[PDB]
């Protein structure tokens, strides 16, 4: 029989996802990191075991994506430092162990001022850490998931530079194919520009070339960003040359016909750019603020549309942003500690969306 799955397949395989937030992602200057722990707990998360990292499962999940960021773990020519290497590969094990996919990434690596965000001056570091993880989990099977990069911007003056992030998402395939073993074949995400639909979508993004074609691209679904993102007690601010302040209305609920339909409109763009040309789409988050004045009710309608559309659209899936708990996160739906969620209805839609009910 066959032993491979094409990329649309896969991600059709992968269900339903979750990802482990603000663990093994963690960064701040003021923590001095010193062991894998001090960024494993910095955010207020507490160190994960297996239970911790795959109970998920049973309510309908089958994909964790595992958010790590990598800087504090790199000497100064890249190298990363055993330990940190080895606690990474303990949780892909546990997932994989579980029989559920993991999407591995590098994370806040690329955030504004970290050095990632330079952009191509620094493709032969992004090339020296892709070969070492590349290198570690070459014999792994098609569970696992390598993912370029999580939310990078580059531009060029006011243009989006699409040359830049091709440049190193090219960089991250050809290191990674080059290592052979079953990386020659493994699916792999590409990050669309700062994972933005619109911008991913649009006429100037370059996908990177793979004769495997075994490629997904990554959008993350905060939209529209005044109900997901948009803190509602610290509104978003501008502020004129004359210094007057003006607020950015956060919105609290979602849902009306015209939401509805720009939803519908977000995921044919999605779909006839990508999926339709054989390269499935994996929203590696969606999430809305947990901790705010968003109505619950609304929370629960947005995630259960979206995932709904997702189970609807071939080579779709979603991937939850997930904190855990507030004193470590600002997007909390299941208790990983505890094996709570915090909505039982967030929970029984997802139980009744991955059985097909
Ligand atoms: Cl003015
Ligand atoms: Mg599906």
């Known amino acids: 029989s066959s032993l491979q799955k094409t990329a649309i397949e896969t991600v059709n395989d992968m269900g339903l996802g979750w990802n482990l937030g603000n663990t093994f992602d963690c960064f701040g200057t003021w923590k001095e990191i010193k062991t894998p722990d001090d960024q494993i707990t910095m955010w207020g998360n507490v160190v994960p075991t297996e239970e911790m990292v795959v109970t998920i499962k049973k309510y ?15 000497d100064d020519s890249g190298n990363v430092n055993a330990e940190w290497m080895s606690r990474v590969k303990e949780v892909v094990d546990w997932i994989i162990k579980a029989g559920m996919y993991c999407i591995l990434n590098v994370h806040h690596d690329g955030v504004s001022g ?3 965000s330079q952009g191509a001056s620094v493709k032969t570091k992004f090339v020296t850490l892709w070969t070492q993880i590349a290198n570690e989990f070459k014999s792994y099977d098609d569970h696992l998931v390598l993912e370029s990069m999580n939310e990078v911007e580059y531009k060029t003056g006011n243009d989006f530079d699409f040359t830049t ?3 190193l998402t090219q960089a991250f395939v050809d290191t990674v194919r080059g290592t052979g073993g079953n990386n020659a074949d493994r699916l792999l995400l590409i990050s669309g520009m700062n994972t933005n639909l619109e911008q991913t979508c649009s006429s100037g993004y370059k996908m990177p070339t793979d004769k495997a074609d075994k490629l997904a691209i990554s959008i993350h679904y905060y939209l529209p ?24 209305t956060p919105m609290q609920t979602w849902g009306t016909e015209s939401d509805y339909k720009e939803m ?4 044919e763009t999605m779909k006839v750019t990508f999926a339709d040309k054989g390269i499935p789409v994996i929203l590696g988050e969606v999430g809305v603020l947990t901790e705010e004045q968003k109505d619950k009710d609304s929370i629960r309608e947005f995630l259960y549309a979206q995932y709904s559309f997702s189970a609807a659209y071939d080579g779709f899936m979603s991937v939850l942003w997930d904190t855990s708990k507030n004193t470590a996160g600002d997007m909390n739906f299941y208790n990983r500690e505890t094996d709570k969620w915090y909505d039982e209805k967030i929970r029984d839609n997802f139980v009744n969306i991955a059985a097909g009910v």
Not at 225 to 248: L, M
Not at 264 to 267: A, P
């Open 60 to 74: 309908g999940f089958n994909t964790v994506r595992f958010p790590v960021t990598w800087m504090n773990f790199m």
């Open 264 to 267: 519908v409109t977000n995921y």
């Open 225 to 248: 960003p005044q109900f997901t993102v948009e803190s509602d007690k610290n509104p978003w601010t501008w502020t004129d040359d004359q210094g007057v302040v003006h607020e950015i």
């Open 165 to 167: 992030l091709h440049t």
């Open 114 to 116: 970290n050095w990632l």
